[PDB]
Amino acid sequence: VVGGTEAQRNSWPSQISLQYRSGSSWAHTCGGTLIRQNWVMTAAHCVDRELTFRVVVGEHNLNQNNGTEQYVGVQKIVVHPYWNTDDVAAGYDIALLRLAQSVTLNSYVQLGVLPRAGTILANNSPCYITGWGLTRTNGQLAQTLQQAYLPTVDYAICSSSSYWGSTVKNSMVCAGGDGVRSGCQGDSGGPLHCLVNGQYAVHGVTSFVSRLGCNVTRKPTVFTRVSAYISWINNVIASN
Numbered sequence: 001v002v003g004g005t006e007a008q009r010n011s012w013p014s015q016i017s018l019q020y021r022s023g024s025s026w027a028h029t030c031g032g033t034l035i036r037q038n039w040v041m042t043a044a045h046c047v048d049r050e051l052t053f054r055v056v057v058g059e060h061n062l063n064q065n066n067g068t069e070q071y072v073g074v075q076k077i078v079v080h081p082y083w084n085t086d087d088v089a090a091g092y093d094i095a096l097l098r099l100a101q102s103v104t105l106n107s108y109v110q111l112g113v114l115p116r117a118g119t120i121l122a123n124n125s126p127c128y129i130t131g132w133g134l135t136r137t138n139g140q141l142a143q144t145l146q147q148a149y150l151p152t153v154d155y156a157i158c159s160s161s162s163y164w165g166s167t168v169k170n171s172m173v174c175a176g177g178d179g180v181r182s183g184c185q186g187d188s189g190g191p192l193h194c195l196v197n198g199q200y201a202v203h204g205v206t207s208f209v210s211r212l213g214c215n216v217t218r219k220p221t222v223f224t225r226v227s228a229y230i231s232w233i234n235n236v237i238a239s240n
């Protein structure tokens with residue numbers, strides 16, 4: 001997260017750290033959202049490889065042990081069938097991970113609230129991106145969870161020529177683009193939390209930013225619109 005501030009340790013309890021094993025160690029690669037005690041929602045481009053993954057819930061400081069973490073292995077990975085490996089621009093950037101064990105909910109670990117199917121937000125709706133991604137283009141990962149205020153940019157403006165044009169589809173949500181704050185490498189797959197009816201709901205899965213830079217003016221961070229996928233999500237969970 002670029003242009004962000006450190007989050008309180010109990011502000012966003014649904015946020016998870018998706019890690020893969022490098023050698024004998026583990027490295028953070030993407031964010032994710034706890035949606036069931038044994039299911040995690042993230043981006044398809046994060047689990048697109050035959051890597052060994054694990055999820056860390058109740059995490060705040062990537063390097064230090066906070067005394068609140070739960071490390072769980074990933075039993076199965078369901079990528080959306082229409083996801084095309086290269087194409088982040090084509091859409092369908094979403095996947096679900098069945099955890100090998102059900103995690104314990106407490107004040108540092110809670111389930112994310114999903115929106116009602118088809119829900120579209122008004123322009124400039126108040127949302128926050130969270131993550132341990134790069135704090136600067138070509139910089140390094142944050143050690144502690146960062147958050148940044150990223151209001152939405154509705155489809156009409158986002159798909160216009162001065163913004164993302166045809167690259168952005170209706171199954172995506174745009175947020176930010178002020179040239180100061182944005183998502184950045186390592187935030188991928190994590191949540192876009194939006195205040196709706198006095199309640200914070202996860203409306204997006206972090207997908208992409210400008211190849212030319214993370215905080216580029218008029219190049220908002222783009223997310224997979226969760227509300228466009230409520231039926232798929234429920235079908236996967238119900239079926240396996």
Ligand SMILES: *[C@](=O)([C]([N]C(=O)[C]N1C(=O)C([N]S([C])(=O)=O)=[C]N=C1C1=[C][C]=C([N])[C]=[C]1)[C]([C])[C])C(F)(F)F
Nearest residue numbers: 029045088183184185186187188206207208209210211
């Ligand atoms: C995420 O943390 C990271 N996501 C990406 O970098 C996704 N991404 C892009 O933003 C582009 N930029 S674009 C649309 O070409 O202007 C291109 N490719 C990717 C991408 C595709 C596939 C894979 N496996 C990885 C990256 C944040 C910027 C949100 C990630 F990817 F690093 F984990």
Ligand code: NA
Nearest residue numbers: 061064065066
């Ligand atoms: Na930690």
